Structures are given as C-alpha cells and as structure tokens.
Design a protein around this ligand. Structure first.
Ligand SMILES: [Zn+2]
Ligand SMILES: [Zn+2]
Ligand SMILES: [Zn+2]
Ligand SMILES: [Zn+2]
Lengths: 153, 153
C-alpha cells in the first residue's frame, strides 16, 4: 500500500493538490483532490515522463509512455500510461478530481512517483482530433500548472 | 533510473537546481548544482522522507531513515540515509554543490526519487552537538528551500 501527493503550481492562477492511493501493487490507483483558478470547462490532465520542472512545465517532456503507444483517453486501449483524460472546472473555476485508473501505478514500471502531473489550458481531445498532434498530446493547449509526484505518509 | 533533478524553492530568496546521477544501481550517486540566496557559510542539506509539499517545506516529515539510525554526517556509518551534511555558500551567497554519496540511491530501498531535498538556515552539526536534538536533526535550524526529487532519466 502506497500513497503519493502532488502540488500543482504555475505562473498564473492555476493551483491544486492531487492525492494518489494504491491499496495493492497491481491494483487501481485512486486519484483525488482539487484544482482551482481554472476557466470553466474541460482541461487536459496527464502525467509527463520526467519530474523535471527546471524550465517550468516544458522540462517534464512527453506524456509518460513506457509502451511507446499513441495518445488516447484513459479508457482507450491505445493510450500513454500517463493519459488521465480531462478534469472539469465549474463556474467558480474549481475542478474537483475523483478518478480511478488501473494503468498508472505507485510502484513497478508504470510508477508515476517522481514524474510530473500537469493540467492544461484546453480539453484533451483524447486522440480523436484527426491530426498528428492529437495522436501525440491530445491538443490540450499550453500547460497551466504542474508539480512532481511525491511519496506521501 | 540513472538521473534525477530537484528544484529548491522557499518563501525567501533561496533557490537552486540540484542534479543527481547514478549509472550503476548499487553505485555512487553524483550530486551537483548550485543554490543561491544563502548567507555565507555552512547550510544543512538533507533528504526528508516524504515528497509532500502541501504545507511548504514543513510537511516533508523527518530525515529519510529506512535503516532506523541516528543523525550523522555523510561520512558516518551511523547516519540517516538522507543525511547529506552541509553545503557551503560563498560571499555572494552561492553554494556550488559537489557530492558523491553511496548511501542515497536513485532506485531500491534507499531511493530518494519522490522525496524532499531541503537546505537549512544554519549548519548541520553532524550529530556532534552534544544535546539530544543533535542526534535527531543536527540543529540546522529552519528550512529555507525544498523541492521534490524527480526522475530526469
Ligand atoms: Zn498522452
Ligand atoms: Zn481495439
Ligand atoms: Zn538526519
Ligand atoms: Zn568504521
């Protein structure tokens, strides 16, 4: 049993705290928390490969993708390990996050600890946008906030 | 993994980027980079157990200590895995960091990925202060800057 936590911060208003919990080494991972300072609507939400924020969110690189797959939604059979779809911000700019995912992990080779959680300007088109960027990143526009995923007590 | 990076930030002017390399899984870890905005002199430098920065540098818990040892210097056999001694800041408040350590690791039981690197207000006394706190924390005062250690390769 493992827990992780991530504090998302950026250059603007977007700020949040995301908790991860995994009860068993191969089990589903529970992702929950809150992000605020968002424009109402859907925002791309994923894990980038590196826990590298030296030049801001760019340094974190491509979506975490150890199986060398194409970008997709979290319930698609072709996706990056890091692909967690969209979070939804309400009228107050608050995205209450409550995800379960069975592909990310807090141990083993899908371990996302030490990697970067990021929230984006626009919606993830889930790899269904009909262009090359869709199949790479989901066309979610610029990165608004990110942080390194750490071990939690 | 093989390469790590940590961005240190605080509420004051202390900031820096710390790199880690370990090409052999049991082997030494090279630690290098620079921390600026420090008072001239020795500053405690350690890995805390949790990569939890939800309440700033406070929420990262105790020195990383999976072997249940007392606080020591990095050269000591009795030390916390996280005990990395002191960095030295010059007249301009810049601390060039150059360290080789074979107790921390970028994988396994002593993996520091997902944990907190911190730099302190004053010197770590390396467990030689004579009081009770010395063998607990090394009396390095308050936490000036921290960050979560992330995967870089
Ligand atoms: Zn993706
Ligand atoms: Zn199919
Ligand atoms: Zn210690
Ligand atoms: Zn000896």
């Amino acid at each position: 049993a493992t827990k992780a936590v991530c504090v998302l911060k950026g250059d603007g208003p977007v700020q949040g705290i995301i908790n991860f919990e995994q009860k068993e080494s191969n089990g589903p991972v529970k992702v929950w928390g809150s992000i605020k300072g968002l424009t109402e609507g859907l925002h791309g939400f994923r894990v980038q490969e590196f826990g590298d924020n030296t030049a801001g969110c760019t340094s974190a690189g491509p979506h975490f993708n150890p199986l060398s797959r194409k970008h997709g939604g979290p319930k698609d059979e072709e996706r990056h390990v890091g692909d967690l779809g969209n979070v939804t911000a309400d009228k107050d700019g608050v995205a209450d996050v409550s995800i379960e995912d069975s592909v990310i992990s807090l141990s083993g080779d899908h371990c996302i600890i030490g990697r970067t959680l990021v929230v984006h300007e626009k919606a993830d088109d889930l790899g269904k946008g009909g262009n090359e960027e869709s199949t790479k990143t989901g066309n979610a526009g610029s990165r608004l906030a990110c942080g390194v995923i750490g071990i939690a007590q």
